[PDB]
Design a binder for this molecule. Structure first.
Ligand SMILES: CCCCCCCCCCCCCCCCCC(=O)OC[C@H](COP(=O)([O-])OCC(O)COP(=O)([O-])OC[C@@H](COC(=O)CCCCCCCCCCCCCCCCC)OC(=O)CCCCCCCCCCCCCCCCC)OC(=O)CCCCCCCCCCCCCCCCC
Ligand SMILES: CCCCCCCCCCCCCCCCCC(=O)OC[C@H](COP(=O)(O)OCCN)OC(=O)CCCCCCCCCCCCCCCCC
Ligand SMILES: CCCCCCCCCCCCCCCCCC(=O)OC[C@H](COP(=O)(O)OCCN)OC(=O)CCCCCCCCCCCCCCCCC
Ligand SMILES: CCCCCCCCCCCCCCCCCC(=O)OC[C@H](COP(=O)(O)OCCN)OC(=O)CCCCCCCCCCCCCCCCC
Ligand SMILES: Nc1nc2c(ncn2[C@H]2C[C@H](O)[C@@H](COP(=O)(O)OP(=O)(O)OP(=O)(O)O)O2)c(=O)[nH]1
Ligand SMILES: [Mg+2]
Lengths: 345, 320, 82, 53, 98, 63, 48
């Protein structure tokens, strides 16, 4: 791609969620959703391989179906209430279809079957763009209508999201699929805390984003697609294993890392609203998430997997690849827990 | 200023800096047949940068101080040991082959970066497109195994189509008895311990497999020794050579820019040569890797990034 | 000199793009030059697609006319003389 | 050059002095009930202004 | 109007169920997607004309334009699938499972 | 220093902790009551704006 | 001259050094001025 279409595509990718967040109209949040989808599709099919085409096709058909369901809900609300916003008395069926389609857009379970496959087959920076940027707009639409949604449907969607995400991330080996089921579990946490306190939903979203960014940067340092590929990182870049361990433990929610704070304050608010059984099941599935994180840590940092012979030449070569804001996001995603009252509102 | 998208926007166009002599020329031949001298003369009288054969210590000579490092840092594979005993149980043969392919890949990346940055043509000796010849020769001689062949083919499939084929491939056809006579006359005692079966395997791999895949996508210039041993007719053919086939015609400025980024980042170049395929020939254990990596780190000038090593005279470290 | 030669031999070899670009530039600049540009908006304002609703006056406003056949009000003599 | 060579030996004593300072700051912060406990409610001596610092 | 709006919503529901139940033709899937798009256009237009909402009659034009660009993107993707596989069969799209 | 210093420091700490406890219980009650019947600053869900309503006389008199 | 290739960081980027040092100095001075202004504003508002 030449810089003209690079700038246009990145500007529309930026602009979609910005229109969705800045917009007070259901129609404009919709059109921002397909700015995001349409602008990001050439970026998935940038590599021009059958796997990228497969991911782009599945992603397109999923988002198209969900966007048509969203527009159905918008049109039905427009007939029922004469306005372009779910104000207070729109139909619960309409609100549930809206929640259905936004959960389909997000890729949380049981609508999660496309997210690991779409995350696979695309480059790592597009996995980062998807799993971080493409979720703010559906979260924005969900946050705008928090008192109207159905707590039962949200709680079911959330608990099965964490269940399927924990089990998948336990299952596979591929880094992109691991990050995708990690995203599914984290979106389950955000969705569960959505109807009671959207501020904690935003806090969990920012914590997940600042944890997902240095994962993907560290993967892009060596294009480590595999558990083995990140396992020989000690020969390639040994000065990163400590932060890999700290940020993966933060993703697991282990104190005193700052990734414990979203799960902790979410459990605290859920128990303020008396859903103890739900909170316990969520925390146990978070322990499963921490299990596959700990296996990944064992593979990459605490043990030293055998290496190759060309790694000598790769160490002979130099590198200027790792960017400056990797360390800033890494430190903010590891050592921010004593600033918890400042992080929460 | 480091090359990038900003430099491409401000104007660093490869097609703007191209000229007639901006060509990739590769000289190929058997073990001892006039390959070095002809490439040097062609580059000298065409105004082109000559790249000799990438040996074991190519990365050592191109990185750091440029002195050859120890063998355990540079591949831990000996061509002399391979000539003395090619069927050794430690896997010296396939380690040497993979290390030489990695060296040739680094040399091809350097030559491509030089051509895309300065516009000067390059004359390489035995680039990556004619190293599977040595691979298949050792496989047919039984020196390596089918798993090594599959791993080499996988690495070649991973790395090879990302770059551009050479504009011209000049080949030196030479008989095996002539190669044997030249090897005996050279006087390297390890090098006389090579088999005519191995040399015939190299020549057969050339004739049957390397020349056609060059032939449908670039210009092939097979010559004898007597057609060679005079670097004027070959240069005349290079002058009267028309490049009307291959993917070089379809390249434009932004494809050149992305290829320039790929060849200017050496880690992406050698990314797929270190895939976690655990052949016992090339797999190195954690303890040996730890010791070798550590000793390479207290090697002088290699502890930190270049320009940050105070022991070699780098200044303003605190200020940068 | 060179710019004038570039437009000149461009007009020589192909005038379609030259005429289209000149028509583009003229369409940009002529609303900023002609004095009739405001009159289109004035005419569109003066065109009465809706009923003018009468106002209940308390006598404190003298600008509004009691009768349509009065000197007071926005007459369209400029429209007649346009 | 002795201060340059053995500058690492002051970090732990500096941390000790800083910890004593922070204990003193906490002690003067928690003075909401000084000379107000009913067990120790006594009239102040003329030569003193606080029971404890 | 309520009977015809109910018919339009059942048309959208049938097109959605057809989209959700795949057959061998991604072209047929895209056609079901535009069945949903067309049903959305008629419901929006009839609602606007019934409510006399002249401020919101641009909304059908915007849904038509946006959905048409989205389907152009999808047609380009189907062209890529047909080029890489010979056909547009959705069961050829399955090697991202592992 | 002496036992009275620790005694009165403990008194101050207990006073601060008890005040924090009753404040947390009261803010739980405040949030529950305000969410149940929003009539104060918090939990004020949005409402369409009256400033975007046309009040000029229109073509149809029956409005 | 040790390295065979000219290092990127062989010489310090003087423009980057000057911009970083001036930026840090500017934020420090602005921080002190805003802290003093906030202290004065708080005392004026609360009558202290
Ligand atoms: C001190 C602690 C914090 C250190 C932070 C920096 C870390 C670092 O860079 O370390 C390297 C560096 C040492 O490197 P080096 O030996 O010089 O050379 C580098 C090698 O050549 C590099 O060789 P290499 O890279 O080729 O190979 C090494 C590589 C090889 O890789 C490995 O060996 C992999 C190891 C895997 C296992 C470990 C996984 C990670 C475990 C982390 C701990 C987790 C549990 C702890 C508790 C939970 C924490 C959340 O990495 C390592 O061995 C590990 C590197 C990091 C080590 C330091 C880790 C520090 C953080 C953890 C401890 C402190 C926090 C927790 C405890 C807090 C108190 C309870 O560390 C330091 O220099 C430490 C700082 C010392 C000076 C402090 C000065 C303070 C001045 C204050 C005044 C001025 C500022 C005023 C500010 C306010 C103004 C208002
Ligand atoms: C509030 C929400 C703010 C937005 C949160 C989500 C941000 C997601 C990341 C967007 C940008 C990603 C991107 O452009 O990735 C490609 C690039 C590759 O890195 P590289 O080519 O080395 O370029 C860095 C040059 N120094 O990678 C990057 O440049 C990585 C940039 C990551 C920025 C993360 C910001 C998190 C929020 C603060
Ligand atoms: C409602 C949900 C169940 C609908 C079942 C429809 C029939 C069916 O099972 O179709 C399966 C078929 C699968 O696709 P195909 O490519 O044909 O696969 C070959 C079959 N192995 O699927 C298709 O070919 C797609 C069929 C789409 C049909 C859309 C319209 C459905 C109208 C009837 C609705 C259900 C009525 C049920 C009546 C029960 C008795 C009263
Ligand atoms: C919560 C956290 C909030 C703060 C987050 C951002 C922290 C500062 C990030 C900027 C920074 O540190 O810039 C330093 C950088 C040093 O420049 P240098 O490494 O010399 O790179 C030149 C290479 N040719 O300098 C520059 O990049 C240019 C100078 C600073 C420009 C601003
Ligand atoms: N096994 C093996 N040996 C190689 C490979 N590449 C080069 N060699 C050997 C062949 C020679 O004995 C030695 C030097 O390479 P050359 O082909 O340049 O030989 P030499 O310089 O003697 O002859 P020349 O005049 O350059 O053709 O390295 C390779 O990929 N594998
Ligand atoms: Mg030679």
């Amino acid at each position: 791609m030449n810089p003209i279409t690079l700038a246009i595509i990145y500007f529309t990718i930026f602009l979609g969620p910005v229109i969705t967040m800045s917009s007070t109209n259901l129609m404009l949040m919709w059109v921002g959703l397909e700015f995001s989808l349409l602008a990001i599709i050439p970026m998935l099919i940038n590599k021009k391989n059958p796997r990228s085409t497969e991911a782009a096709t599945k992603y397109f058909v999923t988002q198209a179906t969900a966007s048509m369901i969203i527009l159905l809900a918008i049109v039905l609300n427009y007939k029922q209430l004469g306005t372009w916003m779910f104000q207070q008395q729109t139909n619960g069926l309409i609100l549930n279809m809206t929640l259905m389609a936004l959960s389909m857009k997000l890729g949380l379970a049981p609508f999660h079957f496309w997210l690991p496959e779409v995350t696979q087959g695309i480059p790592l920076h597009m996995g980062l763009i998807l799993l971080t940027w493409q979720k703010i707009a559906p979260l924005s639409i969900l946050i705008q209508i928090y008192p109207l949604l159905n707590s039962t449907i949200i709680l079911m969607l959330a608990i099965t999201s964490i269940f399927m995400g924990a089990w998948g991330g336990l299952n596979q080996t591929q880094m992109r699929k691991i990050m995708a089921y990690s995203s599914i579990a984290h979106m389950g946490w955000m969705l569960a805390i959505l109807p009671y306190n959207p501020s904690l939903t935003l806090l969990n979203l920012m914590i997940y984003i600042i944890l997902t960014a240095p994962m993907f940067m560290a993967l892009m340092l060596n294009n480590s697609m595999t558990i083995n590929s990140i396992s020989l990182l000690w020969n390639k870049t040994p000065a990163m294993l400590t932060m890999i361990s700290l940020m993966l433990l933060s993703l697991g929610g282990l104190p005193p890392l700052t990734g414990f704070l979203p799960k902790w304050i979410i459990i605290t608010e859920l128990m303020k609203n008396n859903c103890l059984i739900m909170a316990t099941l969520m925390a146990m599935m978070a322990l499963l998430n921490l299990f596959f994180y700990t296996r990944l840590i064992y593979s990459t940092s605490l043990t030293m997997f055998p290496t190759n012979n060309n790694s000598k030449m790769m160490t002979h070569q130099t590198k200027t690849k790792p960017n400056l804001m990797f360390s800033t996001l890494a430190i903010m995603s590891t050592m921010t827990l004593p600033l918890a009252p400042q992080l929460i509102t | 200023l480091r090359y990038g998208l900003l430099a491409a926007i401000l104007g660093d166009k490869t097609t703007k800096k191209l000229h007639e002599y901006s060509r990739v020329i590769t000289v190929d031949g058997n073990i001892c047949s006039g390959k070095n001298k002809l490439a040097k003369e062609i580059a000298q009288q065409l105004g082109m940068k000559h790249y000799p054969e990438a040996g074991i210590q190519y990365s050592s000579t191109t990185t750091g101080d440029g002195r050859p490092l120890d063998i355990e840092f540079s591949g831990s594979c000996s061509l002399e040991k391979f000539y003395d005993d090619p069927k050794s149980n430690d896997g010296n043969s396939y380690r040497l082959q993979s290390w030489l392919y990695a060296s040739r890949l680094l040399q091809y990346a350097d030559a491509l970066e030089h051509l895309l940055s300065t516009g000067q043509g390059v004359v390489l000796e035995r680039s990556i497109y004619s190293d599977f010849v040595f691979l298949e020769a050792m496989y047919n001689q039984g020196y390596i195994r089918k798993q090594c062949v599959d791993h080499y083919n996988e690495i070649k499939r991973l790395t090879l189509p990302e770059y551009l084929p050479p504009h011209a491939v000049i080949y030196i056809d030479v008989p095996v008895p002539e190669v044997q006579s030249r090897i005996q006359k050279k006087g390297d005692p390890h090098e006389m311990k090579v088999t005519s079966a191995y040399l015939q395997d190299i020549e057969n791999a050339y004739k049957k497999t390397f020349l056609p895949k060059m032939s449908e996508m670039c210009e092939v210039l097979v010559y004898d020794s007597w057609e060679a041993e005079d670097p004027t007719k070959v240069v005349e053919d290079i002058e009267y050579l028309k490049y009307n086939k291959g993917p070089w015609l379809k390249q434009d400025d932004w494809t050149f820019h992305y290829l320039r980024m790929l060849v200017q980042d050496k880690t992406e170049v050698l990314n797929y040569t270190t895939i976690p395929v655990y052949l016992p020939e090339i797999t190195i254990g954690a303890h040996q890797g730890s010791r070798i990596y550590n000793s390479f780190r207290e090697l002088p000038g290699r502890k930190y990034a270049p320009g940050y090593n105070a022991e070699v005279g780098d200044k303003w470290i605190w200020l940068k | 000199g060179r710019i004038s030669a570039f437009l000149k031999n461009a007009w020589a070899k192909e005038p379609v793009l030259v005429v289209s670009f000149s028509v583009w530039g003229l369409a940009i600049i002529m609303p900023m030059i002609s004095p009739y540009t405001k009159y289109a908006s004035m005419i569109n304002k003066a065109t009465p697609y809706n009923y003018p609703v009468p106002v209940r006056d308390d006598g404190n406003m003298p600008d509004v006319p009691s009768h349509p056949q009065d000197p007071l009000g926005p007459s369209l003599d400029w429209l007649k003389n346009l | 050059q002795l201060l340059r060579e053995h500058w690492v030996h002051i970090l732990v004593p500096a941390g000790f002095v800083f910890g004593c300072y922070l204990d003193r700051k906490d002690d003067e912060k928690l003075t909401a009930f000084r000379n107000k406990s009913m067990l120790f409610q006594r009239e102040l001596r003329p030569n003193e202004e606080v029971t404890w610092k | 109007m309520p009977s015809t709006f109910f018919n339009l919503t059942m048309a959208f529901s049938l097109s959605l169920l057809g989209t959700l139940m795949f057959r061998s033709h991604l072209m047929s899937t895209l056609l079901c997607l535009e069945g949903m798009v067309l049903s959305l256009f008629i419901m929006t237009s009839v609602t606007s004309l019934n409510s006399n909402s002249m401020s919101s009659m641009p909304i059908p034009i915007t849904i038509l334009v946006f959905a048409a660009c989205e389907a152009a993107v999808g047609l380009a993707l189907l062209v890529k699938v047909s080029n890489t596989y010979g056909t547009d069969y959705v069961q050829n799209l399955n090697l991202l499972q592992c | 220093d002496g036992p009275e210093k620790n005694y009165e420091k403990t008194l101050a700490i207990l006073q601060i902790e008890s005040e924090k406890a009753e404040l947390r219980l009261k803010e739980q009650e405040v949030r529950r009551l305000m969410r149940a019947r929003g009539d104060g600053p918090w939990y004020q869900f949005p409402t369409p704006e009256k400033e975007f309503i046309d009040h000029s006389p229109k073509a149809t008199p029956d409005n | 001259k040790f390295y065979v290739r000219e290092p990127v960081n062989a010489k310090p980027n003087w423009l980057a050094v000057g911009l970083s040092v001036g930026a840090s100095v500017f934020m420090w001075i602005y921080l002190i001025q805003t802290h003093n202004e906030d202290v004065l504003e708080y005392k004026r508002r609360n009558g202290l």
